[PDB]
Amino acid sequence: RILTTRNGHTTSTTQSSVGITHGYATAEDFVNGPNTSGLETRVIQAERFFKTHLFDWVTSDPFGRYYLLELPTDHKGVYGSLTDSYAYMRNGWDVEVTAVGNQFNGGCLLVAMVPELCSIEQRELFQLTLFPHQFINPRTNMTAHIKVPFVGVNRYDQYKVHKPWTLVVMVVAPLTVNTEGAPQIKVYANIAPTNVHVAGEFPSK
Amino acid sequence: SGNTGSIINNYYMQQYQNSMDTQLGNDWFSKLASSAFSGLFGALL
Amino acid sequence: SGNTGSIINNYYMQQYQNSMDTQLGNDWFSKLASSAFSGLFGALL
Amino acid sequence: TTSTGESADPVTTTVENYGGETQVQRRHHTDVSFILDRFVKVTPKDSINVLDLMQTPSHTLVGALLRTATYYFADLEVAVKHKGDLTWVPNGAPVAALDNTTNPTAYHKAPLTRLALPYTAPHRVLATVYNGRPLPTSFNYGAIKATRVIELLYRMKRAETYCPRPLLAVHPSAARHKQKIVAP
Amino acid sequence: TTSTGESADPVTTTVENYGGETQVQRRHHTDVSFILDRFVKVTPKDSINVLDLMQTPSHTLVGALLRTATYYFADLEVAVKHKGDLTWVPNGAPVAALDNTTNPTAYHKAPLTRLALPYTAPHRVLATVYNGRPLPTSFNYGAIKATRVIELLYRMKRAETYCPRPLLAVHPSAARHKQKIVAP
Amino acid sequence: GIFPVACSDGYGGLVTTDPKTADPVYGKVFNPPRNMLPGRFTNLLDVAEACPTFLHFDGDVPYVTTKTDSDRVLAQFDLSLAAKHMSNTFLAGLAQYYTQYSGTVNLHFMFTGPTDAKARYMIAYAPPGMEPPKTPEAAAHCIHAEWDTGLNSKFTFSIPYLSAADYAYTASDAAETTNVQGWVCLFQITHGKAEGDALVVLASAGKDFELRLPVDARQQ
Amino acid sequence: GIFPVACSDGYGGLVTTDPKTADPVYGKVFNPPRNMLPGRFTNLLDVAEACPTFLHFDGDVPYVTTKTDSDRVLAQFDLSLAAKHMSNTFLAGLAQYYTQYSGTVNLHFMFTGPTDAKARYMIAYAPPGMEPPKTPEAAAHCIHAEWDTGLNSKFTFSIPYLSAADYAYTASDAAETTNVQGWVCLFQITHGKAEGDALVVLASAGKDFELRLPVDARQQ
């Protein structure tokens, strides 16, 4: 039930989590390859949480609204400065998507961290439970907390061009404010980069 | 091992037959199928 | 050993395959590459 | 077998819940490196065409069990009906290279010409989709040219794939997708 | 890594000077007896032509990694499309010899005729350049004749060379020598 | 004399599925390392068992709503890997490239109502020969099994494999309108203040699913 | 009966790079001895490492003169084995017959001024993504390294290999104007009575240069 996760100097507590969904691996692969010549360093100051707004769940939305965002998104803090001050870098992800409703709102919600994609057709939605996923069901839980490692074609990636992961939500069953439930839900996210490495330095202005 | 069905070693060497692999320093989805919970979750009668 | 990639000895004898060598009584440029000085030449700090 | 559904934890209850007894289930025909080794046929181009594993159609057996895996690595094989002196450049050669005879060149010998060429690419593993639809230039196996290429086939060797992707069956209008089946 | 430069002593400082760590560098594709064994094609003459390893063009892959070594020794191979009864004299035979059948003579058999002939010459090792441009008569491998030679190829075996010589890349007008590369 | 062989007749043709391998031309290639890339799968049925996918009920939604009227049947469909209710799912997408199958097919039922809504459901399996049942009281002689909603949401019932022939087809020819495999019916016994709720369903491969005789036949 | 074989189809063609060897016709030849001829080299990269060669700066000379004006940049060029500044050198002449490379490339800088002239230089490596630096104060955040002239004349700095993909091309297609590998800039910090002097440069293969995928493509 109760579960407290901590990344860096930031924490988070949830009292209804149904577990963590490790995806595609438990540990990361070898991070000192032959391409970087050993000129790579591991920054630890940039493994803290940060937040964003996805959308607002509402009764009008039928099955199949996804509203996906691709990340690494723009970042005010430290991790946002690394892609500006370094060429190649790699990092996993540790998401947490929260939708606080009520004990009495029926409906469902599916969230999965899928690899590289731009758009999904309506037929492929029925098969979204192949990627690391978790259901948000307002009768029981309110947080997802998927946990995926870095994966890509080549070892170190240039985040100015290739965005490998893409957090995807989806309304499996419509919201129903039957009698006493909250009129609408506002979905948020609590992503946090984990295990960030970085190599190759830029000349400033 | 794919559609390879001869009991004689191929005439050509291994390195000329195909690209030799290199090491540094189904695997995962088969670990998932074995983790599958199958027992009863309640008290049987 | 060049583009020779069979695991079976050639049907013809060695002397008929190619000119047999004769003795009397990469060799040098590979000795040069190993002689290459690479350490630091001054006092590091 | 009630269990928390919103957990993505696999739960495969069996027939032994109500007296059943599972027979033995052996799966050889559904392996990933056994089903891809079958000479899928691609729509061949004119004189010069590139060896890219994605120009194969998306409704074949090899073309559709390949666009179900995000990443893949596999050696290659071809068998072409060249009307000429087909040559083959490696990955990354200037496209004017496939006019010289020093590159691996097979001479005409009726009817086919079956080659087994390695996997040459900078990346440790290729990819079907790419989040830049056009993929980069680096994703290929090489380029062959002849006077008039007539046929072309692909047969992946040692195939191994990662990170699955959705597969789609044909949607029928009726309740059930009926059709013909061979019968004496 | 300051060292006296006017000494011709090789000095190869590495990436470990500022924290680096050299990966492993394996070189098989650049050996001297592996890169020359590739059937370079020469401009074939009429009925009679001589087997000299220097009439191959100076811009191929075999013709240009050969005019980078002062001396060389290598057995030979050919594969010619003779329209006739091709014969082959050894090195130094009177040029009227390649009309008799006792000399090694291959009969017509479509499409090619691949031979593996030894290295016969007085000198212990041949040479590309010679400070007597015309080289002497003694520098060759033999002479073949047929009714009409159509194609000819050279494939050195057991090649081994000495005393390197300069190699030249093409000089571009722009800052960088751009060109096409194969792309899907 | 040389070793004399006899060139046999009717051999050596390029069969598209021969076990032989071609002869190389280039050789000596060392590719980059791939030690422990995340998420490799070896067999195509391993992913089918570990990951379920939704069905396709009436309309486009994958869920069935609770019937408040005199009717009690939610939705009953054929037991065929070509059926419409299984049009777009992994297990039925993969099983169009193979001819025959033999095994169990799990069904995962997940209730997504409010905290103050309760319901009770039944799923039964009717074999071929008799028309499918139409009332729960007339379907209790099958291999049915009932579950009740509560703290644990999902319930998974694995319909068995019963067939005279050892293996069964993954297609439906027009000549056979009898649906040789049978049906699988899903009824709703009763419900309490469960108006307009949802029961999303899923489908996964069984513990002993077997799929064989590969034929790539006109899908892409 | 004789041993029956099946003549396979689509085999035996004369591939220009087959590992097979032809059958002899003459035999029994003993060639003159070659025991220990001077100067044999086995690999083509061994000569590339042990012997450096000059670059091709502006004009035709291989040296750069000292800038006495407000400018501080001597000459910056692309990091590509096809670049113009490396037009005619062994390492770039050999690397046109191969497709890909991966390793380090040493640069040897040799100062040839009088005894009473002093100078100080910097060389920095700027990766792709940002335009190259234009001032030494804005280039000190790279992998730079500075040296000073004195008793020992030559200083050798080996630019590293940094790349996402494991191997990199030895060509530059017109579609890619971005110079995917980067730049290498060379600046002159200050100088004392160093008018019109010379700093000849060289270039050699690294300790772990690797060159592969041979293609002889239209140079001779």
Taking residue E138's Cβ as centre, other Cβ atoms within 10 Å add up to 11
- CA end-to-end span of chain F: 55
Q: Which of A149, A91, A158, A151 minimizes the C-alpha distance to D136?
A: A158
Bridging pattern class, strands E48-50 and E143-145: antiparallel
Taking residue B7's Cβ as centre, other Cβ atoms within 10 Å add up to 4
Helical ranges in chain F per DSSP H = 44-50, 90-94
Task: Say if CB G119 and CB G149 are below 8 A apart.
Answer: yes
Domain ranges of chain A: 1-205
Chains within contact range of chain B (3+ C-beta pairs < 8 Å): A, C, D, F, G
Helical ranges in chain G per DSSP H = 44-50, 90-94
Task: Say if CB G97 and CB G219 are below 8 A apart.
Answer: yes
Give the whole-angstrom CA distance, residue E149 versus residue E46: 6
Q: Which of C38, F35, F37 minimizes the C-alpha distance to E20?
A: C38
Q: Tokens 């990933």 identify what position?
A: D32
Give the whole-angstrom CA distance, residue D101 versus residue D121: 22
Task: Say if CB D70 and CB D135 are below 8 A apart.
Answer: no
For residue F142, give every residue at least 6 positions away whose Cβ sits within 8 Å of its Cβ, in sequence order, or none: F124, F125, F126, F133, F185
Task: Say if CB A31 and CB A92 are below 8 A apart.
Answer: no
Phi, psi of F27 (to 5 degrees): 70, 165
For residue C26, give every residue at least 6 positions away whose Cβ sits within 8 Å of its Cβ, in sequence order, or none: E32, G40, G41, G42, G43, G46
DSSP A113-145: EE-S-S---TTGGGG-TTSSEEE--TTT--B--
Give the whole-angstrom CA distance, residue E167 versus residue E67: 8
Phi, psi of E71 (to 5 degrees): -120, 150
A30, A31, A36, A37: best mutation site toward chain E, by most E Cβ within 10 Å?
A37
Collapsing DSSP to helix, strand or coil, A111 comes out as strand
Q: Which of B6, D107, B7, D124 minimizes the C-alpha distance to F25?
A: D107
CA G99 to chain centre: 14
Exposure string over G82-121, b if 16+ CB within 10 A, otherwise e: bbbbbbbbbbbbbbbbbbbbbbbbbbbbbbebeeebbbeb
Helix then strand then coil, in percent of chain A rounded to 5, is 5, 35, 60
Question: Minimal Cα–Cα distance from G170 to chain D, Å?
Answer: 9
Residue F10, judged by CB atoms within 10 A of its CB (0-12, 13-18, 19+), counts as exposed
CB-based touch C/A (3+ pairs, under 8 A): no
Contact C3 F24 (CB under 8 A): no
Q: What is the CA radius of gyration of chain C?
A: 22
Q: Does D6 touch chain A (CB under 8 A)?
A: yes
Contacts of A151 in chain F (CB under 8 A): 37-39
Question: What are the beta bridge partners of residue F156?
Answer: F108
Nearest-10 Cα torsion for D43, D49, D51, D54: -50
Question: What are the beta bridge partners of residue G43?
Answer: E31
Residue G165, judged by CB atoms within 10 A of its CB (0-12, 13-18, 19+), counts as buried
Give the whole-angstrom CA distance, residue A99 versus residue D8: 18
What's the DSSP call for residue G97? S
Q: Does G166 touch chain F (CB under 8 A)?
A: yes
Question: Minimal Cα–Cα distance from E9 to chain C, Å?
Answer: 7
Question: Angle A151-A154-A158 (CA atoms, 0-180°, nearest 5)?
Answer: 90
Nearest-10 Cα torsion for G91, G96, G102, G108: 20
Contact B24 A30 (CB under 8 A): yes
Which amino acid is residue E108, in one-letter code?
H
Q: What is the CA radius of gyration of chain E?
A: 22
Task: Say if CB F215 and CB F97 are below 8 A apart.
Answer: yes
Contact F8 G5 (CB under 8 A): yes
Contact C6 B12 (CB under 8 A): yes
Give the whole-angstrom CA distance, residue F99 versus residue F109: 28
Q: Tokens 């695991």 identify what position?
A: C7
Nearest-10 Cα torsion for F20, F26, F29, F35: -30
Q: Does F30 touch chain E (CB under 8 A)?
A: yes
Contact D140 E112 (CB under 8 A): no
Chains within contact range of chain C (3+ C-beta pairs < 8 Å): B, E, F, G
Cα nearest neighbour of A34 on chain B: B24
**Cβ contacts from B onto F, under 8 A:** 76
CB-based touch C/D (3+ pairs, under 8 A): no
Nearest CB to C33; choose among G21, G36, G49: G49
Collapsing DSSP to helix, strand or coil, G170 comes out as coil
Q: Which of A139, A136, A134 minimizes the C-alpha distance to A181?
A: A139
Question: What are the beta bridge partners of residue E127?
Answer: E71
Distances in Å between the Cα of B34 and the Cα atoms of A134, E1, E68, F50, F112 are: 20, 58, 62, 9, 28
Helical ranges in chain D per DSSP H = none
Task: Provide the chain D residues 53-92 that lie in CB contact (below 8 A) with chain B.
Answer: 75
Nearest-10 Cα torsion for F131, F133, F137, F139: 90
Give the whole-angstrom CA distance, residue B31 versus residue F39: 10
Task: Say if CB A46 and CB A194 are below 8 A apart.
Answer: no
Q: Does D102 touch chain G (CB under 8 A)?
A: yes
DSSP F103-121: S-EEEEEEE---TT-EEEE
Q: Which of A195, A190, A143 minimizes the C-alpha distance to A10?
A: A190
HEC profile of chain E:
CCECCCCCCCECCCHHHHCCCCCCCCCCCCECCCCCCCCEECCCCCCEEECCCCCCCCCCCCCCCCCCEEEEEEECCEECCECCCCEEECCCCCCCCCCCCCCCECCCCCCCCEEECCCCCCCCCEECCCCCCCCCCCCCCCEEECCCECCCEECCEEEEEEEECCCCCCCCCCCECCECCCCC
Task: Say if CB E14 and CB G53 are below 8 A apart.
Answer: no
Cα nearest neighbour of F27 on chain G: G19
Task: Say if CB F58 and CB F205 are below 8 A apart.
Answer: no
Q: Which of E78, E80, E85 minimizes the C-alpha distance to E102?
A: E85
Domain ranges of chain C: 1-45
**Cβ contacts from D onto F, under 8 A:** 243
Task: Provide the chain C residues 9-38 that lie in CB contact (below 8 A) with chain E.
Answer: 17-19, 26, 29, 32-33, 35-38
Q: Tokens 């001589």 identify what position?
A: E50
**Cβ contacts from A onto G, under 8 A:** 62
Nearest-10 Cα torsion for G60, G66, G69, G75: 50
Question: Minimal Cα–Cα distance from A174 to chain E, Å?
Answer: 43
Task: Say if CB B41 and CB D2 are below 8 A apart.
Answer: yes
Starting at the edge strand found earlier in the chain, the sheet holding E48-50 runs: E48-50, E143-145, E87-89
Give the whole-angstrom CA distance, residue E162 versus residue E155: 19
Task: Say if CB D69 and CB D164 are below 8 A apart.
Answer: yes
Give the whole-angstrom CA distance, residue D182 versus residue E43: 59
Give the whole-angstrom CA distance, residue G15 versus residue F176: 54
Contact A29 F197 (CB under 8 A): no
Q: Tokens 């291989």 identify what position?
A: G62
Q: How was this structure determined?
A: cryo-EM
What's the DSSP call for residue G132? P
Contacts of G17 in chain C (CB under 8 A): 3
Task: Provide the chain E residues 110-129 that lie in CB contact (below 8 A) with chain D.
Answer: 111-112
- CA end-to-end span of chain D: 45
Residue F68, judged by CB atoms within 10 A of its CB (0-12, 13-18, 19+), counts as exposed
Q: Output the CA torsion sign for E81, E83, E88, E91.
A: negative
